Design an enzyme around this catalytic site. Structure first.
Site, PDB file in Angstrom:
ATOM      1  N   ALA G  45     109.205  58.379  93.612  1.00 17.67           N
ATOM      2  CA  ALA G  45     110.006  58.780  92.470  1.00 17.67           C
ATOM      3  C   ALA G  45     109.424  58.264  91.130  1.00 17.67           C
ATOM      4  O   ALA G  45     109.519  58.940  90.105  1.00 17.67           O
ATOM      5  CB  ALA G  45     111.454  58.365  92.664  1.00 17.67           C
ATOM      6  N   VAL G  67     114.222  61.167  96.484  1.00 16.88           N
ATOM      7  CA  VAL G  67     115.199  60.428  97.261  1.00 16.88           C
ATOM      8  C   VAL G  67     114.890  58.956  97.175  1.00 16.88           C
ATOM      9  O   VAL G  67     113.845  58.534  97.599  1.00 16.88           O
ATOM     10  CB  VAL G  67     115.172  60.867  98.733  1.00 16.88           C
ATOM     11  CG1 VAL G  67     116.157  60.042  99.579  1.00 16.88           C
ATOM     12  CG2 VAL G  67     115.481  62.351  98.822  1.00 16.88           C
ATOM     13  N   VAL G  68     115.806  58.182  96.606  1.00 19.77           N
ATOM     14  CA  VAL G  68     115.678  56.734  96.584  1.00 19.77           C
ATOM     15  C   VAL G  68     116.843  56.148  97.354  1.00 19.77           C
ATOM     16  O   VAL G  68     117.986  56.374  96.998  1.00 19.77           O
ATOM     17  CB  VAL G  68     115.667  56.187  95.139  1.00 19.77           C
ATOM     18  CG1 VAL G  68     115.258  54.718  95.132  1.00 19.77           C
ATOM     19  CG2 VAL G  68     114.723  57.010  94.277  1.00 19.77           C
ATOM     20  N   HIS G  75     114.273  46.186  94.921  1.00 19.84           N
ATOM     21  CA  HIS G  75     113.307  47.189  94.488  1.00 19.84           C
ATOM     22  C   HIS G  75     113.951  48.538  94.144  1.00 19.84           C
ATOM     23  O   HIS G  75     113.549  49.201  93.177  1.00 19.84           O
ATOM     24  CB  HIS G  75     112.173  47.335  95.509  1.00 19.84           C
ATOM     25  CG  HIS G  75     111.003  48.133  95.015  1.00 19.84           C
ATOM     26  ND1 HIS G  75     110.335  47.836  93.841  1.00 19.84           N
ATOM     27  CD2 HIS G  75     110.387  49.226  95.533  1.00 19.84           C
ATOM     28  CE1 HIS G  75     109.371  48.724  93.655  1.00 19.84           C
ATOM     29  NE2 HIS G  75     109.368  49.566  94.673  1.00 19.84           N
ATOM     30  N   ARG G 114     123.973  64.995 100.567  1.00 16.80           N
ATOM     31  CA  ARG G 114     123.732  65.508  99.218  1.00 16.80           C
ATOM     32  C   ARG G 114     122.494  66.397  99.101  1.00 16.80           C
ATOM     33  O   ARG G 114     122.132  66.791  97.995  1.00 16.80           O
ATOM     34  CB  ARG G 114     123.633  64.333  98.239  1.00 16.80           C
ATOM     35  CG  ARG G 114     124.984  63.695  97.965  1.00 16.80           C
ATOM     36  CD  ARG G 114     124.936  62.291  97.348  1.00 16.80           C
ATOM     37  NE  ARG G 114     126.286  61.774  97.112  1.00 16.80           N
ATOM     38  CZ  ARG G 114     127.088  61.278  98.049  1.00 16.80           C
ATOM     39  NH1 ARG G 114     126.714  61.226  99.312  1.00 16.80           N
ATOM     40  NH2 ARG G 114     128.302  60.847  97.729  1.00 16.80           N
TER      41      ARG G 114
HETATM   42  O1  LIG Z   1     129.188  65.017  83.886  1.00  9.43           O
HETATM   43  C1  LIG Z   1     128.973  64.548  85.021  1.00  9.43           C
HETATM   44  N1  LIG Z   1     129.937  63.816  85.628  1.00  9.43           N
HETATM   45  C2  LIG Z   1     129.798  63.265  86.845  1.00  9.43           C
HETATM   46  O2  LIG Z   1     130.710  62.580  87.354  1.00  9.43           O
HETATM   47  C3  LIG Z   1     128.537  63.464  87.594  1.00  9.43           C
HETATM   48  C4  LIG Z   1     127.542  64.270  86.902  1.00  9.43           C
HETATM   49  N2  LIG Z   1     127.794  64.807  85.598  1.00  9.43           N
HETATM   50  N3  LIG Z   1     126.460  64.382  87.647  1.00  9.43           N
HETATM   51  C5  LIG Z   1     125.243  65.134  87.480  1.00  9.43           C
HETATM   52  C6  LIG Z   1     124.391  65.135  86.218  1.00  9.43           C
HETATM   53  O3  LIG Z   1     125.106  65.076  84.987  1.00  9.43           O
HETATM   54  C7  LIG Z   1     123.669  66.452  86.537  1.00  9.43           C
HETATM   55  O4  LIG Z   1     123.911  67.449  85.555  1.00  9.43           O
HETATM   56  C8  LIG Z   1     122.214  66.280  86.981  1.00  9.43           C
HETATM   57  O5  LIG Z   1     122.011  65.020  87.607  1.00  9.43           O
HETATM   58  C9  LIG Z   1     121.252  66.391  85.821  1.00  9.43           C
HETATM   59  O6  LIG Z   1     120.452  67.524  86.015  1.00  9.43           O
HETATM   60  C10 LIG Z   1     126.800  63.713  88.757  1.00  9.43           C
HETATM   61  O7  LIG Z   1     125.983  63.605  89.747  1.00  9.43           O
HETATM   62  N4  LIG Z   1     128.003  63.117  88.765  1.00  9.43           N
HETATM   63  C11 LIG Z   1     128.623  62.374  89.847  1.00  9.43           C
HETATM   64  C12 LIG Z   1     128.353  60.895  89.895  1.00  9.43           C
HETATM   65  C13 LIG Z   1     128.833  60.448  91.273  1.00  9.43           C
HETATM   66  O8  LIG Z   1     128.043  61.064  92.298  1.00  9.43           O
HETATM   67  P1  LIG Z   1     128.202  60.655  93.861  1.00  9.43           P
HETATM   68  O9  LIG Z   1     129.616  60.996  94.189  1.00  9.43           O
HETATM   69  O10 LIG Z   1     127.881  59.193  93.949  1.00  9.43           O
HETATM   70  O11 LIG Z   1     127.214  61.552  94.535  1.00  9.43           O
HETATM   71  O1  LIG Z   2     110.948  58.011  95.948  1.00  4.72           O
HETATM   72  C1  LIG Z   2     111.015  56.837  96.372  1.00  4.72           C
HETATM   73  N1  LIG Z   2     112.062  56.414  97.113  1.00  4.72           N
HETATM   74  C2  LIG Z   2     112.198  55.168  97.587  1.00  4.72           C
HETATM   75  O2  LIG Z   2     113.209  54.885  98.275  1.00  4.72           O
HETATM   76  C3  LIG Z   2     111.130  54.167  97.310  1.00  4.72           C
HETATM   77  C4  LIG Z   2     110.031  54.688  96.510  1.00  4.72           C
HETATM   78  N2  LIG Z   2     110.009  56.037  96.065  1.00  4.72           N
HETATM   79  N3  LIG Z   2     109.106  53.768  96.259  1.00  4.72           N
HETATM   80  C5  LIG Z   2     107.822  53.906  95.609  1.00  4.72           C
HETATM   81  C6  LIG Z   2     107.767  54.142  94.118  1.00  4.72           C
HETATM   82  O3  LIG Z   2     108.422  55.336  93.739  1.00  4.72           O
HETATM   83  C7  LIG Z   2     106.290  54.232  93.734  1.00  4.72           C
HETATM   84  O4  LIG Z   2     105.599  55.190  94.521  1.00  4.72           O
HETATM   85  C8  LIG Z   2     105.561  52.909  93.872  1.00  4.72           C
HETATM   86  O5  LIG Z   2     106.291  51.892  93.209  1.00  4.72           O
HETATM   87  C9  LIG Z   2     104.168  53.020  93.265  1.00  4.72           C
HETATM   88  O6  LIG Z   2     104.254  53.463  91.924  1.00  4.72           O
HETATM   89  C10 LIG Z   2     109.605  52.719  96.929  1.00  4.72           C
HETATM   90  O7  LIG Z   2     108.968  51.592  96.940  1.00  4.72           O
HETATM   91  N4  LIG Z   2     110.810  52.890  97.539  1.00  4.72           N
HETATM   92  C11 LIG Z   2     111.516  51.888  98.329  1.00  4.72           C
HETATM   93  C12 LIG Z   2     112.870  51.445  97.844  1.00  4.72           C
HETATM   94  C13 LIG Z   2     113.346  50.406  98.841  1.00  4.72           C
HETATM   95  O8  LIG Z   2     112.423  49.309  98.838  1.00  4.72           O
HETATM   96  P1  LIG Z   2     112.639  48.036  99.815  1.00  4.72           P
HETATM   97  O9  LIG Z   2     112.984  48.618 101.125  1.00  4.72           O
HETATM   98  O10 LIG Z   2     113.740  47.281  99.093  1.00  4.72           O
HETATM   99  O11 LIG Z   2     111.311  47.363  99.842  1.00  4.72           O
END
Ligand SMILES: O=c1[nH]c(=O)c2c([nH]1)n(C[C@H](O)[C@@H](O)[C@H](O)CO)c(=O)n2CCCOP(=O)(O)O
Ligand SMILES: O=c1[nH]c(=O)c2c([nH]1)n(C[C@H](O)[C@H](O)[C@H](O)CO)c(=O)n2CCCOP(=O)(O)O
Ligand SMILES: O=c1[nH]c(=O)c2c([nH]1)n(C[C@@H](O)[C@@H](O)[C@H](O)CO)c(=O)n2CCCOP(=O)(O)O
Ligand SMILES: O=c1[nH]c(=O)c2c([nH]1)n(C[C@@H](O)[C@@H](O)[C@H](O)CO)c(=O)n2CCCOP(=O)(O)O
Ligand SMILES: O=c1[nH]c(=O)c2c([nH]1)n(C[C@@H](O)[C@@H](O)[C@H](O)CO)c(=O)n2CCCOP(=O)(O)O
Ligand SMILES: O=c1[nH]c(=O)c2c([nH]1)n(C[C@@H](O)[C@@H](O)[C@H](O)CO)c(=O)n2CCCOP(=O)(O)O
Ligand SMILES: O=c1[nH]c(=O)c2c([nH]1)n(C[C@@H](O)[C@H](O)[C@H](O)CO)c(=O)n2CCCOP(=O)(O)O
Ligand SMILES: O=c1[nH]c(=O)c2c([nH]1)n(C[C@@H](O)[C@H](O)[C@H](O)CO)c(=O)n2CCCOP(=O)(O)O
Ligand SMILES: O=c1[nH]c(=O)c2c([nH]1)n(C[C@H](O)[C@@H](O)[C@H](O)CO)c(=O)n2CCCOP(=O)(O)O
Ligand SMILES: O=c1[nH]c(=O)c2c([nH]1)n(C[C@H](O)[C@H](O)[C@H](O)CO)c(=O)n2CCCOP(=O)(O)O
Ligand SMILES: [K+]
Ligand SMILES: [K+]
Ligand SMILES: [K+]
Ligand SMILES: [K+]
Ligand SMILES: [K+]
Ligand SMILES: [K+]
Ligand SMILES: [K+]
Ligand SMILES: [K+]
Ligand SMILES: [K+]
Ligand SMILES: [K+]
Ligand SMILES: [K+]
Ligand SMILES: [K+]
Ligand SMILES: [K+]
Ligand SMILES: [K+]
Ligand SMILES: [K+]
Ligand SMILES: [K+]
Ligand SMILES: [K+]
Ligand SMILES: [K+]
Ligand SMILES: [K+]
Ligand SMILES: [K+]
Ligand SMILES: [K+]
Ligand SMILES: [K+]
Ligand SMILES: [K+]
Ligand SMILES: [K+]
Ligand SMILES: [K+]
Lengths: 147, 146, 147, 146, 147, 147, 146, 147, 147, 146
Positions: G45, G67-68, G75, G114
């Site tokens: 990411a 996806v994080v 981290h 999601r």
């Molecule tokens: O106005 C907003 N109010 C919100 O509550 C909201 C928004 N927007 N978003 C999305 C964000 O604004 C959206 O447009 C994209 O992430 C950007 O492209 C969101 O993902 N949320 C929800 C935040 C909570 O999400 P979870 O239930 O944890 O998945």
């Molecule tokens: O998209 C991502 N999703 C992730 O969940 C993730 C990512 N990326 N990275 C790597 C990071 O985005 C970079 O590639 C890296 O830091 C080199 O720039 C990561 O190091 N992670 C791990 C996050 C969790 O780390 P630990 O398990 O706490 O070590």
């Protein structure tokens, strides 16, 4: 004295005999002022000077630009000179660093020869520019943060 | 104008004429209530803008003084181009008046006639100082108070 | 040698035979220096060069601008040349990349031909600009961060 | 390191601890050949970045020293956020190392243990000065010569 | 195939055995991709990384940041990590150059060791960061101006 | 003394009794230091402060920011505080002008009352901030160009 | 929306989930009659913002997918901070919508829920592409035209 | 009164009934202050607000941002709120224009409703943000150049 | 119909009778368009105009620059005019605000008088500049964000 | 070239000639299958750059059209200098081609001969639109895509 001033000199190479003489004057003024090791770099033409001066200004207190532009049969002289003027001015103000202009801009070879501090020259604009560069660095040093 | 922070940077080529411009500038300043403007000297006109830039950081106005007289080559044109480009840029970057009292003449007689010596028709150093101070006071009144 | 440097050439097309001659000189210098495959892009007129050169500078160590501006019946020559000078200069300093000026600015066609490195030409400003670009990139590489 | 131009700006909240950090910084500097670093004092940590910015203009490195100790409110969090954002910005704007010797602790005992007093386990002022100087020398070698 | 890419690696030195392990993984990735001599620079702490990364980005297609930040008794950990994050992110976008973040930020030493690619480690984030840098540099090359 | 320092004070209005007390402390420190006529401006909330501070920093040597943020039932407290912190920090560095932070950020009304220099308060952060602002302006004055 | 120039940049950590977000985004774009969107893959990411910056030069909108998932260490927090700061900066520098379809969850189940698979409650890849297109259309309508 | 100020309102659409309630409050304040026809633009989510607000700031004296972010099951709430805070703050300072934050950031729907100025709501943050925007524009107008 | 547009006029004072005549034409245009109270500021010479125009552009939709530069015995005329041109052009583009150039640049006094809209004048460039400013401001309003 | 978003800004001084340049530009655009170009009028050539700046935000290319003819005074020179400096700046700020179809002649006959009426040797309005479109297409090809 100026011994703690970090000096760079960039000299183009078009009209090499004249360019080498401007460089010699610049280096001699530097050495006379207690700087035996200025950063010295060569470029081909005057247009190449500003981008190199920009790099040198990142880690020097002053840069001397040296070169020789002599008018030919075309308008190109005008535009080489405009580029150098625009470029060096911009570099000085972006970097807040003196960029001394020892780039000769003459109508004739005789005029350039007369200004290069060759043996029979009336003056040496390379030496003059180097004085300008050092004196301005020293002045800025006194104006800036020290306490 | 007694509260305005004034700086004057004067080059040194054609020294007697430069000193005469500086005299007119200092006298205008003192008459307006400023006995202690920041005054700095540089070698040639090309060196003025980088020093003006430093001074603009902490002054309400900067007066640039110097003397460029046309010689045998086009170098005159390029010195004057650099001063013009430079001072204009510094003024706008800093939002601070940078008054242009750099003489640009074809002859020495023309420069002398503009340096406010006993027989001179005018004094461009004094004029440039009036310009600097008037513009600073104008910007003061246009800006944020009270 | 320059075999590691990434070179781009942008050449305008007004006065096409002269432009092609400039380009031939540029490519020959580049190949002589170890570069067989410079990025080469064509534009219509000299005024179109700077915006394309800006794009090429994002991805290259040096850009060579080639073209031919010949004085006509009006002041327009002056403003074309001013625009090119201003733009190439800005692009070089914004991008910290040499932008070599191989844009001919002449009063007559005869002068342009004499500077395009045709067989009877006195010189080749397209070749000269490429030497300038490559030599400046190499200099900048040595000045910049390495271990 | 005898040619490097060093500045140190130290805030003053928790003065004895601040003075101890400054002592360690000055001693590292002098040991490395620098008897006369530019040294400036400010009131609180929030005031450091604007002074560091001025100093970065003409120094190869700046050491930021201070002491923030968590109190009853979230104010601690925001003081530390501002110092972090500020010093990071100044370093990158100026391309100059800005070493972070601003203690951020929950207790006074933690701050004292990091100020290089007789019983302290470490001296973060000294550490920050080593960081500043080493980074300046590194950038020197990476940059344009000769 | 990253043989043409100019890679720099900047590694801090706090927790030196672990830092060296990250660097070992980084260098092995680079060499496997055809890069035997990446520019490698050491700094004291993680906070020193971004200004050096900034310098390296001017002359490289990708920079890998390596280091090890482990939570101690104070909130200082949080601000060190904040500085690194804000810094590398800004440098990447200012320079339009990938800055891979292989700076470990863990609660414990055992966690840092487990991510440093030693014989018993679950993973090597030095190696991962280097893959990320090179892959992103190659992607940008494809996307940018070429023929 | 500080009598030549050009001081501006911007105070938000949320929790008006507390805000008015911070403003009173700021103005009293100013007057104590020989400044009877600081530029004083009011805004509604703490988020409105930075844009006004930005305007004031154009023609003042220092700006004091005053306000009161008290945590409620939601996360909004966090984001009001982040905005103010980010904004004032950016304004100070864009304008190279001290922006003193006397914006209270408390968990409870009692904590804010205790810090506003009301009659029974333990301290007055408005007064403190004003000292910070003046002392920093004076320091910058001594560091800057005077000769 | 057929006239909007769309780019999608998706990271590859948790590849199955990233591919599902990408599938949702592509389906929305095809649903709105879009010309073949520009699609780029990056590793993590953190690599997204610099590639999104490149893409915003030549597109009316960019969708960021990834996806994080929180692990054992802090981290996760710094990965998410970098993505948030970067995307926000890129959008404002380029005056181009950068839609954030980067999942930031505590668990794998939350991310799957999601990513718009058949048993998923939501598809944030689809949502992000709708946001990108809607915003591009709005800005077109606000900007200079007949 | 504010009859000369040019007001824009950008409102996101997640939690639409609450957004519409915020917008009602904003328009009512604006109309109360002499402005019957503010520029009103809708976006999907809060993250989409800053780029549209930037556009509106080029042409308006004040912009009011309206929206509703409610905490869900993941950390994503935090990063949405961070992005909005960061972006609105930047847009205000880049454009030197008040950007009022009427984006609700709550833990529950109940809290959002209680802040949207429905009949039984404790308060109306959409109205509050519009007072903030208009009052700040008026203040800036008085501070700025006039005769 | 320019009743809503915020107009500023900055006029220098060298050749004062002619400057006043230009300003008279400017004010009459503004009043005819429904603007009885434009912001009007006087400066000493033309070179002083751009920094004041810059200030006015922060708070106005259009600025009209008025003044009179007449060629004397020296090249100074050329550099005054160069400064005005570079300055107003930069301010317009930095501020995205029309800056109309009603600064006369003539060889003689008779030429300046003939362009100042006196009873026997061929034209009024003060008036023309004001039409240009207002028309361009209205054009930009149409092009920019509204409903 | 049918996909390129074209804007044309033409000044109105010497209105008959300006209208002829505009006619040539419009004909080229229609010839290359262009969607209705965005067309804006301004009074004088000096007003062009700021409107071109606005248009470059929402278009792949902008064509600048106008007529400057030398008169009795130096004013011609400064009008042309402003246009040249402005258009060049706008093109590089926006990374968008700004084609220069602003005639700069000594006489009315020269401008008529360059405005593509039936007896005209050239049409610089047409030429400028070709340059704009060709450059936009080239930049699209150079930039990020599949
Ligand atoms: O106005 C907003 N109010 C919100 O509550 C909201 C928004 N927007 N978003 C999305 C964000 O604004 C959206 O447009 C994209 O992430 C950007 O492209 C969101 O993902 N949320 C929800 C935040 C909570 O999400 P979870 O239930 O944890 O998945
Ligand atoms: O998209 C991502 N999703 C992730 O969940 C993730 C990512 N990326 N990275 C790597 C990071 O985005 C970079 O590639 C890296 O830091 C080199 O720039 C990561 O190091 N992670 C791990 C996050 C969790 O780390 P630990 O398990 O706490 O070590
Ligand atoms: O204030 C100045 N007045 C001048 O008349 C002058 C100056 N300066 N300079 C050069 C300086 O500006 C100088 O500092 C160098 O360019 C170094 O930067 C000059 O070269 N000149 C001389 C112009 C005439 O030159 P020539 O006779 O044609 O060689
Ligand atoms: O790479 C690093 N890893 C670390 O774990 C670390 C570092 N660096 N630093 C400080 C450095 O980043 C340092 O260079 C200074 O801040 C000076 O700029 C640190 O102060 N730490 C320690 C964090 C834990 O501190 P404490 O145990 O809570 O005092
Ligand atoms: O160096 C500092 N160390 C500190 O511990 C501290 C500082 N500074 N400040 C405020 C200063 O940074 C100050 O200058 C003001 O914000 C004015 O700008 C502070 O308000 N603090 C105290 C943090 C604890 O506050 P409280 O007990 O929760 O009110
Ligand atoms: O509006 C103006 N009109 C002018 O004709 C003029 C002006 N201004 N100035 C100078 C001013 O612009 C002045 O403000 C100074 O340069 C100080 O900044 C001038 O020096 N001139 C005179 C140009 C002719 O000068 P000379 O006769 O060749 O010495
Ligand atoms: O230092 C220089 N002195 C010069 O006299 C000169 C130079 N340089 N150049 C060109 C170079 O400045 C530049 O290297 C080239 O444009 C490529 O960037 C350059 O074309 N000239 C010649 C000017 C006279 O041209 P002509 O005789 O009218 O063709
Ligand atoms: O100075 C302030 N102090 C505050 O305590 C406060 C403020 N301001 N604001 C909002 C304003 O800062 C701002 O005017 C608004 O967002 C519009 O820009 C604001 O919403 N609050 C309340 C924070 C607590 O919110 P709640 O009780 O959790 O809803
Ligand atoms: O490379 C070029 N070489 C040239 O000689 C030239 C060019 N270009 N241009 C046009 C300019 O480059 C053109 O592309 C547009 O002005 C920009 O859109 C031109 O108008 N010229 C001709 C200059 C002389 O024109 P006159 O004969 O005075 O009309
Ligand atoms: O497109 C134009 N073509 C022109 O020939 C011209 C223009 N414009 N302008 C006006 C200028 O463009 C601005 O409208 C004005 O300066 C206000 O900004 C002008 O003042 N001119 C006149 C040029 C000749 O001037 P003289 O006859 O020397 O007074
Ligand atoms: K320097
Ligand atoms: K010599
Ligand atoms: K100033
Ligand atoms: K005198
Ligand atoms: K490059
Ligand atoms: K050839
Ligand atoms: K080096
Ligand atoms: K420095
Ligand atoms: K100590
Ligand atoms: K790079
Ligand atoms: K390893
Ligand atoms: K200030
Ligand atoms: K009080
Ligand atoms: K000083
Ligand atoms: K875009
Ligand atoms: K899906
Ligand atoms: K519109
Ligand atoms: K605005
Ligand atoms: K309501
Ligand atoms: K005012
Ligand atoms: K404006
Ligand atoms: K009149
Ligand atoms: K564009
Ligand atoms: K035609
Ligand atoms: K490409």
């Amino acid at each position: 004295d100026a011994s703690g001033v970090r000096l760079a000199i960039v000299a183009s190479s078009w009209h090499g005999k004249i360019c080498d003489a401007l460089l010699d004057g610049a280096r001699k003024v530097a050495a006379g002022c207690g700087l035996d090791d200025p950063t010295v770099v060569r470029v081909l033409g005057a247009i190449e000077i500003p981008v190199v001066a920009q790099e040198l200004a990142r880690n020097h207190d002053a840069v001397v630009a040296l070169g020789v532009v002599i008018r030919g049969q075309t308008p190109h002289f005008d535009y080489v000179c405009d580029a150098v003027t625009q470029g060096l001015t911009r570099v000085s103000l972006d970097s807040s660093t003196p960029i001394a202009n020892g780039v000769l801009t003459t109508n004739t070879e005789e005029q350039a020869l007369d200004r290069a501090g060759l043996p029979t020259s009336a003056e040496d604009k390379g030496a003059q520019a180097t004085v300008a560069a050092l004196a301005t660095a020293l002045t800025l040093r006194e104006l800036r943060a020290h306490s």
